[PDB]
């Protein structure tokens, strides 16, 4: 979004990322490895699913006929009744449009926020020996190929598997 | 090695509007609308739906029933939802009415607006004490009853002066009492018969135009009869007749009396409609076929999937999608990104 | 040592809905609604509130005042807010009226819809030049004036043909002129007296039903009198009477005249109502007790605390909470978290 | 929230955190110390208070009776008037519901943002010798019991009080 | 060295409201509203705008045209948008009408509500077969026709009884047929002439008040004529006359008949209005000067700049700004900060 | 905002920052240098311009007169029609008021978010030898006067210009 543009996040995207919307890339001698983070993808999906349920919860009064106003006899009143219905339809429509607009605004905006959170998952796993650049990238002392990258995505990656120091967990 | 955070790149044919980024392509959406297709109307799921007023009255129109045409009496079940299937209801029998001279056609459409509809079990006026000399009650072959004897609309009494009473009268006044129960509206049906110069004199002893005036809840209506030269018989029994009746209805709110000022040819109110509650009403057609979540004036019966719908907005009742101007979509993916350099 | 950022954990019985996380428990909320309780109605704070039309008219119903019942004349103060306390207003004296035969009962409810209400100071029609031969003005013991002499409704003149003029007339036409001030609506009160055959001939020289027709702003209404056999006296002075009057009202917009076509027994308009502005009107009951920010048709007077309210939505005026479907809560705390392992 | 779930933030909470909604914990030999941050708590409360004022500022026109339409005579008009009131109430109600939903959306969402900001307060105070883990935690070279944590929350913590280096303020 | 991220500090005279920070000063705003200024009315851009019904009928008022006044027949263009410039339309010729005794004045304002308006080319009632004895059609010098001979309203026929027919009659009934094309409303114009006692008998052979009754779509209206003593001629041709006409209109929906019950002096309907579609109508004034995006009842013609506007809300059609309570502004800058020491 | 308040971000502002809304300051021997970031400023302006287009896209039905309801004859009906118009104006106005409030809420709130992203721009440029304090400030080994700061704002700054190590892109 606007954050990633200013922060110098990569503006392009990775076609290799299929299992999910968000994840990690690894750049080294092997070339470029790509892995999706399912947790980050799932969270985004749950937010959207909740947002879909929320929009679907809206109820409005039925518009039916007036019980008393009779055709021919009360045509003037009926014209006003038609007008009342039309304006109700118009007003609720624009309100729903606003609710959906704000929903889509949130979903698209939350992308960089996901990336920022994926930094924190990546950072902790990599241990204190890795170097944070700031553009969403870390420089590692160890090599990290597709097999390595995949363990990161799964959250099972250990830095001791390259004799590197770790943040010992709780 | 350098490890980065990245976002996927895929085909992004779908478009959504945002507040701060305008329209953007995305990898996936959840559609929030559909355009429904026109279908037959149906019963509203979880609610008995009224079509014909009296379902067991075969070969009877709603107006037939509302007027109390002989052979067309029966149970009128309550309903919280009603379909208006005749914008201008018609009769299909009994004595020839000149419908367009009053508001009478809309009477069954008025009734169906109520949840509960019943015909009164006693008469609202005793014809044997009604003003305007002694009467005998007239009938017609146009209105054969359940044993095919000559009858008349059960809501009215075609009162005729006795042979010693064939004489003109000044306009006399009768008060129509409120005979319904707590909370019920009373709908009083009444009118007047007229004929050519000869029959008028035979029946009433007067061939001059007669005058009628009703008054209820601030509403007054005035009529003057026509002597012969009537328009052709229509929507009646098909049996040729030289006379015509004019029919009207009178709404009496709870505890309210009405008055009718009449001369010769008066059709005095007998049985009256007692109605209460409200039925939700929309335009539609018969028969009702199956069930549906939503009855929609334009699409008929439709079941609810998406929360919203696009197309022709109109009156609709039940569990319905909400109308919107445009096919809205909820984003289910990421804003499009080009493949990495 | 490890230092972290953390969030508290507390009992979280309260629930709020979110867009992206559904319903969540929280440690604290700020309630945005209350369900009001029924209270007596009151004066609207910062606005003089009308109850009775004429506060100084003791033993007078609003309809009494509107008709100009003797002893029931007085100042009618302006008000931007009015309580409708009679859905079907009644009289409590003077000559027996057959109320339900016209729209007359609602006359004071029509008047209270205006901010300003005054009775005209001159008569709108001079009875000594009014069509239909020479007249004398009639009075009754049913309508004792301020010195307990025989009087009549000050809005009307019970005009009677003189002894040399006791004869039937063809329907004559009078123009009711517009006599109110700039911007004011004129509300013209009029009617007709009727009796049994004997009194009719004695008073008017005609015992036939008389006919009356008014016309104003496109609205025509037609009446036919009744000769004897009247409904029983009610809402009147309690003195036995053989006759009944029918009363109606006629709205004349600024600078607009109306017409009345009448025969014998006519109650000609005299003093007329002159009204202007609009008063905000809701259903309520009397007396008004104290002050309130808001008058609510269902809950009466209530003061404003929470921004919204739940319960029975109805018409309401003043500084009111806004009705909502559900008891909304503003989150004032943190989403529930289990105690840390 | 969704950030904290992905970021590996602690999903549980601290019953000991009473003076406020947000704050710090210290895990060491002393066991686990817990302190609330009043600055972060006040900010959250003020945001909500302003949000309450905003919701309370909405005004809508009174619904009263029609001045001209008379009972019995104009019952058909009055029915439509009743319908107008019903639909106004319905529409404004749903609009207010939307406004409150978004308000609650903001308040609940802002939690992780508060945590993220407490990181920046904690980090500067702890000095350059501490190690940022990324999960909202810092590992210190020095011990920090409840007395130490209280100094952090109060903003008085100095790293020179453990002969450790500071970012010069 | 220490490098930090910072935000500017500038003059911040503008204020906007926020959800969570209240009102805050900002360095710049984008105004979203303006208060419009009152302007002359105009043509609606992209839509032909109707003013006078018949623009080329010079020295003819809208009411003149609607009544079918001679010389005031002409091209009446269709229009999807119409200006109501007469709240109470007046005539400027032909025989003296007592306008205020019916709803007739609003007739051209009713017509302009339709997109298409045409006068029928055949008569709806044959005067040579109309009930009430044989007739001749009357004319007047007050209504000079296209060759300047004595004429009358093209919508009506001033029928006069022939010399063998100078006699009073009982109320006779004529049925008014529906003669318009598919979808069209028929607006039927009719009325009755009256005069002083002498002229009534010369013309009609009866000097008693005459009675007239119309009936259409459930609506009955009743009139009783006046004999002499009329109000003064106004809004007419200016030629002195002893008689007055009362004019009324009767709306007939597709396929609906109406009836008129009449005696002597009847103005039988001839040419009738056939109208269809809907014109969008707002109050305005003439002449229309130039073009505009929006026609606004209060501001006249105005062009659209800002998306919203403040000021007097009223009916408006076209490409219009949306009314708002307050001059809203979108923030275009940063929240105010004091200069950093 | 509330983030910057808790995070201990500088609450004041810089009058010297003219070319833009957001940017950097440099504190050293030179005194205090100030430069605006055009990229961050442009982004903020674009979001607002898009937000303006969105608000301007709303269409609502015109309110005109009833075709059938005639003055005098149908004044009761006309009163209800006036009420219908009045409530439409009232309801839509409050909806727009809500839409605009949320727009400005987003715009004002996003200020700290811009700063947080400017940290990431600054951090990468400064190279691995710089020290992140946490309050939005970095400590450098090299001097950075106004000429240096301008290079940072422009994104042209290299750490090799002081022979210091860089994150190589
Ligand atoms: C009323 C009658 O007898 N009608 C019968 C019809 O009669 C014709 C001819 O006799 C003839 C007379 O010259 O012309 C018609 O009238 C002419 C005439 O020039 C003048 O009288 C008049 O001024 O101008 C007219 C111009 O047209 C006259 O109407 O002849 C037919 C064929 O022979 C015959 O079928 C008619 O008899 C009626 O028919 C119907 C069914 O077609 C019914 O059987 C009628 O019985 C009823 C009915 O059920 O409707 C019997 C009811 O008991 C009775 N009800 C009451 C309260 O009296 C009704 C009632 O009389 C009429 O319905 C009222 O119009 O009649 C049967 O009478
Ligand atoms: C007119 C009269 O004398 N009425 C008094 C009443 O008279 C009785 C007897 O005449 C009786 C015997 O014939 O007949 C009763 O009516 C008969 C009638 O013959 C039939 O038509 C009818 O169908 O059947 C009836 C019998 O079954 C008739 O009513 O007797 C009572 C008993 O004392 C007496 O009260 C009546 O006198 C009127 O009383 C009231 C008080 O109750 C008033 O004082 C009346 O004075 C007024 C009034 O103030 O209202 C005097 C007014 O000046 C006068 N107003 C005008 C404008 O003239 C009115 C006016 O006459 C009446 O209101 C007209 O109804 O009367 C007092 O007259
Ligand atoms: C018919 C006639 O003579 N009209 C003229 C009228 O004459 C005077 C005198 O006769 C006078 C003598 O006593 O009586 C006046 O009426 C008295 C009446 O006697 C009393 O009972 C009553 O209480 O008071 C009345 C007023 O005091 C009577 O009015 O008036 C003048 C006298 O010269 C004259 O203008 C009248 O002639 C009419 O004038 C107009 C123009 O002003 C037209 O030319 C009329 O021609 C027409 C017309 O075109 O309008 C001719 C038409 O052919 C005819 N239309 C039809 C369908 O027949 C109309 C029609 O008569 C009018 O509408 C009638 O009101 O007249 C011309 O008649
Ligand atoms: C404009 O008005 C003139 C006169 O007002 C109309 O012309 C006239 O029409 C009448 C009746 O048609 C003629 O009067 C006579 O009619 C009887 C009918 O039996 C006839 O027998 C007589 O011989 C006589 O014609 C009258 O002569 C005639 N012309 C004039 C100059 O009066 C004219 O029709 C009107 N214009 C239009 C377009 O209708
Ligand atoms: C973004 O979406 C738009 C609209 O869905 C795409 O534009 C369409 O592309 C198809 C090709 O498959 C054409 O047939 C249509 O005519 C285009 N319509 C419009 C309105 O542009 C566009 O290609 C998408 N962009 C990306 C990058 O996926
Ligand atoms: C249906 O048929 C006839 C109508 O003519 C009714 O039976 C007649 O009623 C009259 C009443 O005056 C009596 O003379 C006899 O009972 C019958 N006479 C003839 C000639 O049939 C019958 O009551 C009507 N109604 C029903 C059956 O409910
Ligand atoms: C929205 O999310 C995805 C769109 O990519 C939809 O498809 C699901 O994606 C998840 C990946 O986490 C997998 O279970 C499958 O690929 C899909 N599941 C199913 C059942 O199709 C997902 O269905 C969408 N959600 C909604 C509510 O529409
Ligand atoms: C979250 O709030 C709900 C609603 O108050 C709690 O559920 C209620 O629990 C009480 C006591 O256990 C019962 O009396 C109610 O009947 C429950 N209501 C419903 C709708 O279930 C729930 O316990 C709370 N959860 C937590 C973790 O605090
Ligand atoms: C109330 O009582 C009577 C009406 O019945 C009025 O008395 C009349 O007063 C005038 C004064 O000029 C006398 O000429 C009449 O002779 C009186 N009539 C009778 C029958 O006594 C009295 O004025 C009325 N007072 C009002 C209306 O204020
Ligand atoms: C929102 O809830 C908080 C609770 O966390 C309230 O804050 C308390 O208010 C009391 C009295 O005003 C004071 O002691 C402190 O401000 C808070 N107490 C504690 C123990 O934290 C706050 O008042 C609530 N806000 C509103 C508007 O009701
Ligand atoms: C922020 O708020 C308002 C902006 O309207 C400023 O107050 C107004 O400033 C004008 C200009 O001199 C003076 O009339 C008064 O000081 C205020 N007038 C009104 C009507 O409020 C305020 O000074 C602004 N503050 C800053 C720091 O820019
Ligand atoms: C919002 O404000 C900005 C500036 O604060 C406007 O952009 C500047 O406009 C001036 C002249 O109007 C130019 O000289 C600058 O080059 C513009 N860009 C800057 C200063 O970065 C912008 O036009 C405003 N937005 C709208 C929609 O009017
Ligand atoms: C914490 O640190 C200091 C060391 O003197 C002091 O406050 C206290 O003795 C220590 N222990 C506890 C439990 O506070
Ligand atoms: C109308 O004429 C009558 C007498 O014929 C008179 O009373 C009245 O003042 C006149 N008014 C006008 C407006 O000419
Ligand atoms: C800062 O930069 C260079 C030296 O590195 C030189 O221009 C001068 O010393 C300084 N100039 C300014 C404007 O501070």
**DSSP labels for F105-123?**
HHHHHHHHHHHHHHHHHHH
Dist. CA B268 → ligand 6 center (Å): 20
Chain F within 8 Å of E26 (Cβ-Cβ)?
yes
CB D21 within 8 A of CB C334: yes
Residues 40..79 of E with a Cβ closer than 8 Å to F: which?
Answer: none
Give residue E233's Cα distance to chain centre: 23
Return the structure tokens found at C23. Answer: 């319903």
DSSP assignment of B140-152 equals: EEEEE-TTS-EE-
- Are the beta carbons of A70 and E218 separated by less than 8 Å? yes
Dihedral sign from CA coordinates of C145, C148, C152, C158: negative
**Any ligand 3 atom below 6 A from CB of E145:** no
Q: Are B263 and B168 in contact (CB under 8 A)?
A: yes
Q: Do domains C1-47+289-341 and C48-288 have the same CATH topology?
A: no
Q: Which residues of D touch C16 (CB under 8 A)?
A: 104, 108
F54 shares contact with chain B (CB less than 8 Å): yes
Looking at all shown ligands, the one closest to residue C15's CA atom is: 8
Residue A95: in which H helix or E strand, if any?
helix A75-126
Looking at domain B48-288, its CATH architecture is Alpha-Beta Complex (3.90)
Mutate to test the pocket of ligand 12, among E332, E333, E334, E335 (most ligand atoms within 8 A of CB): E332
List, in order, residues 6 or more apart from B56 with CB less than 8 Å away: B74, B75
Assign 3-state DSSP to chain F and report helix, strand, coil percentages, each to 5. 50, 15, 35
Experimental method: X-ray
Q: Is C21 on the interface with A (CB under 8 A)?
A: yes
Residues 6+ apart with CB under 8 A from F158: F125, F151, F166
Size of interface D-F (CB pairs under 8 A): 90
Ligand 11 centroid to residue E30 C-alpha, Å: 18
- CATH 2.60.40.2470 describes domain E1-47+289-341: no
CB-side neighbour CA atoms (13 Å) of B76: 27
Residue of F69, F100, F136, F147 to mutate, interface with E, max E Cβ within 10 Å:
F100
Ligand nearest to C-alpha B73: 6
Atom of ligand 10 nearest to the CA of D21: 5
Q: Which of C2, C6, C33, C323 is the mutation pick for testing D, counting most D CBs within 10 A?
A: C6
* Cβ–Cβ < 8 Å for B341, A12: yes
Inter-chain CB proximity D120 and F135 less than 8 Å: yes
Of F50, F59, F103, Cβ closest to residue B21: F50
Q: Are D129 and D144 in contact (CB under 8 A)?
A: no
Distance from CA of F10 to the nearest CA of A (A): 20
For tokens 């099972």, what's the residue? Answer: A156
Chain A nearest CA to E227, separation (Å): 33
Q: E83, E49 in Cβ contact below 8 A?
A: yes
- Ligand 12 pocket mutation, candidates E16, E28, E334, criterion most atoms within 8 A of CB: E28
Note the residue count of chain F.
169
CB B194 within 8 A of CB B265: yes
Nearest to B269 by CA among B179, B334, B332, B198: B179
Q: So where are chain C's domains?
A: 1-47+289-341, 48-288
CB–CB contact D135 A120 (8 Å):
yes
Q: What are phi and psi of E253, to 5 degrees?
A: -75, 165
Retrieve residue A123's tokens: 């950072």
User: Which residues on F lie below 8 Å from C253 (Cβ)?
Assistant: 72, 75
The set of protein residues with a Cβ atom below 6 angstroms from ligand 4 is E 139, 145-147, 149-151
Contact, F73 vs C219, CB < 8 A?
yes
Whether C6 and C334 have beta carbons less than 8 Å apart is answered as: no
Cβ atoms E217, E251 nearer than 8 A: yes
Examine residue B146 and say whether the peptide bond preceding it is cis (omega within 30 degrees of 0).
no
Pair B286, B41: CB distance under 8 Å = yes
Contacts of B16 in chain F (CB under 8 A): none
- Contact B87/E255 with Cβ under 8 angstroms? no
Distance of alpha carbon D59 from alpha carbon A28, whole angstroms: 62
DSSP, res D155: T
Q: Do D50 and E17 touch (CB under 8 A)?
A: no
Point out the ligand 3 atom lying closest to the alpha carbon of residue E139. 57
Instruction: Measure E6 CA to ligand 1 centroid, in angstroms.
Output: 105
Query: Distance, in angstroms, between D109 CA and closest chain F CA?
Result: 13
In the 3-class helix/strand/coil scheme, how is E275-330 assigned residue by residue?
EECCCEEEECCCCCCCEECEEECCCEEECCCCCEECCCCCCEEECCCEECCCCCEE
Tokens linked to D76: 């058909």
Q: Give which of B292, B329, B322 is closest to B307, Cα–Cα.
A: B322
Residues of A in contact with B106 (CB under 8 A): 70-73
Provide Rg for chain E, Cα atoms. Answer: 30
- Distances in Å between the Cα of B73 and the Cα atoms of B56, B57, B90, B140, E258 are 9, 7, 17, 18, 32
Q: What resolution in angstroms, rounded to 1 decimal?
A: 2.7
Contact, C267 vs C120, CB < 8 A? no
Q: Quick one: closest CA in B to D72, which residue?
A: B217
Q: Within 13 Å of residue D55, how many CA atoms lie on the same side as its CB? A: 31
Any CB–CB contact under 8 A between D124 and chain E? no
Query: Distance from the CA of B267 to the center of ligand 5, in angstroms?
Result: 73
- Are residues B281 and B115 in contact, defined by beta-carbon separation less than 8 angstroms? no
Measured in Å, residue C215 CA sits from the centre of ligand 14 at: 21
**Cβ atoms within 10 A of the Cβ of A145, count?**
14
* Distance from residue F59's CA to the centre of ligand 10 (Å): 43
Compute φ and ψ for C122, nearest 5 degrees: -110, 165
Check if B28 has its Cβ closer than 6 Å to any atom of ligand 7: yes
Q: How far is CA C54 from CA C13, C76, C89, C287, in A?
A: 55, 5, 14, 14
Place of tokens 């062009």: E303
Q: Contact, E89 vs E105, CB < 8 A?
A: yes
Chain F partners of E337 at a C-beta cutoff of 8 Å?
A: 11-13
Of B101, B103, B209, which is closest to E170 when you measure between CB atoms?
A: B209
Instruction: Give the residue from F136, C269, C307, B324 showing the smallest Cα distance to E5.
Output: F136
User: Are residues A50 and C2, on separate chains, in Cβ contact within 8 Å?
Assistant: no
CA dihedral B214, B216, B218, B221 (to 10 degrees): -20
CB < 8 Å to A40, chain B:
none
Domains of chain A, first to last: 2-162 (3.90.20.10)
Q: From the CB of residue C196, how many other CB atoms can be counted at a distance below 10 Å?
A: 15
Chain A residues closer than 8 Å to D80 by CB: 66, 69, 77, 80-81, 84
Enumerate chain A positions whose Cβ falls within 8 A of a Cβ in F. Answer: 2-9, 75-77, 79-80, 83-84, 86-87, 90-91, 94-95, 98, 101-102, 131, 133-135, 137, 139
| Neighbors of chain B with 3 or more C-beta pairs under 8 Å | A, C, D, E, F
Q: For residue C230, which of C96, C45, C333 has the smallest C-alpha distance?
A: C96
Task: Give chain A positions within 8 Å (CB) of E219.
Answer: 73
Q: Which atom of ligand 8 is nearest to the CA of C11?
A: 28
Pairing of strands C280-283, C81-84: parallel
C-beta atoms of B221 and E217 within 8 A? no
Cα–Cα distances in angstroms (integers) from residue C202 to residues B171, B172, C128, C141, C243, in the given order: 21, 21, 21, 18, 13
* Residue E63 structure tokens: 């009411």
Any CB–CB contact under 8 A between D73 and chain B? yes
Determine if residue A127 is left, alpha or beta; phi over 0 gives left, psi from -120 to 50 gives alpha, anything else beta: left
In chain A, which residues have their Cβ closer than 8 Å to the Cβ of E253? 72, 75
CB contact under 8 A, D75 and A68: yes
Contact E213 B231 (CB under 8 A): no
**Any chain F CB within 8 A of the CB of B21?**
yes
């Amino acid at each position: 979004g606007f954050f990633g543009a200013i922060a110098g996040f990569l503006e392009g995207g990775w076609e290799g990322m299929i299992a999910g919307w968000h994840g990690y890339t690894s750049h080294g001698a092997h070339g470029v490895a790509v892995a999706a983070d399912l947790k980050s993808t799932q969270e985004a999906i749950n937010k959207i699913t909740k947002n879909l349920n929320s929009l679907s919860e809206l109820e409005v009064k039925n518009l039916q006929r007036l019980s008393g106003a009779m055709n021919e006899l009360h045509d003037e009143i009926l014209e006003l009744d038609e007008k009342v219905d039309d304006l109700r339809a118009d007003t609720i429509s624009s309100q729903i449009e606003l609710a959906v607009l704000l929903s889509n605004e949130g979903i698209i905006n939350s992308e960089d926020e996901h990336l920022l959170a994926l930094e924190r998952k990546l950072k902790k796993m990599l241990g204190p020996s890795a170097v944070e650049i700031g553009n969403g990238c870390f420089e590692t002392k160890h090599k990290c190929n597709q097999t390595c990258l995949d363990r990161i995505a799964a959250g099972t990656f250990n830095a001791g598997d390259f004799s590197l120091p770790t943040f010992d967990s709780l | 090695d350098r490890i980065c955070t990245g976002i996927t790149s895929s085909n992004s044919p779908h478009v959504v509007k945002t507040a701060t980024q305008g329209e953007v392509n995305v990898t996936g959406v959840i559609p929030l609308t559909t355009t429904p297709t026109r279908s037959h109307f149906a019963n509203l799921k979880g609610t008995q739906t009224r079509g014909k007023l009296c379902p067991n009255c075969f070969n009877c129109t709603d107006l037939d029933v509302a007027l109390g045409r002989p052979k067309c009496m029966g149970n009128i079940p309550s309903a919280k939802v009603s379909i208006l299937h005749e914008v201008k209801p018609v009769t299909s029998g009994c004595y020839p009415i000149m419908h367009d001279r009053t508001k009478i056609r809309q009477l069954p459409n008025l009734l169906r607006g109520y949840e509960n509809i019943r015909l009164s079990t006693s008469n609202v006026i005793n014809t044997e004490t009604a003003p305007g000399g002694p009467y005998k009650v007239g009938t017609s072959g146009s209105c054969p009853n359940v044993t095919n004897g000559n009858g008349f609309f059960n809501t009215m009494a075609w009162v005729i002066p006795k042979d010693n009473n064939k004489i003109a009268i000044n306009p006399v006044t009768v008060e129509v009492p409120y005979i319904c129960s707590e909370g019920e509206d009373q709908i009083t049906v009444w009118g007047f018969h007229s004929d050519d110069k000869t029959q008028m004199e035979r029946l009433y002893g007067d061939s001059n135009p007669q005058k009628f005036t009703s008054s209820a809840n601030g509403v007054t209506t005035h009529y003057v009869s026509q002597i012969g030269g009537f328009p052709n018989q229509t929507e009646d029994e098909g049996l040729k007749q030289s006379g015509r009746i004019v029919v009207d209805y009178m709404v009496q709110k709870p505890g309210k009396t009405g008055t009718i000022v009449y001369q010769r040819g008066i059709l005095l109110p007998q049985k009256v409609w007692c109605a209460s509650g409200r039925s939700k009403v929309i335009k539609g057609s018969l028969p009702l076929i199956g069930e549906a979540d939503c009855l929609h004036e334009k699409y008929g019966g439709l079941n609810k999937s998406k929360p919203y719908y696009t197309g022709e907005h109109a009156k609709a009742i039940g569990n319905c999608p909400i109308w919107v101007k445009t096919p809205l979509k909820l984003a289910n993916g990421t804003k499009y990104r080009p493949p990495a350099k």
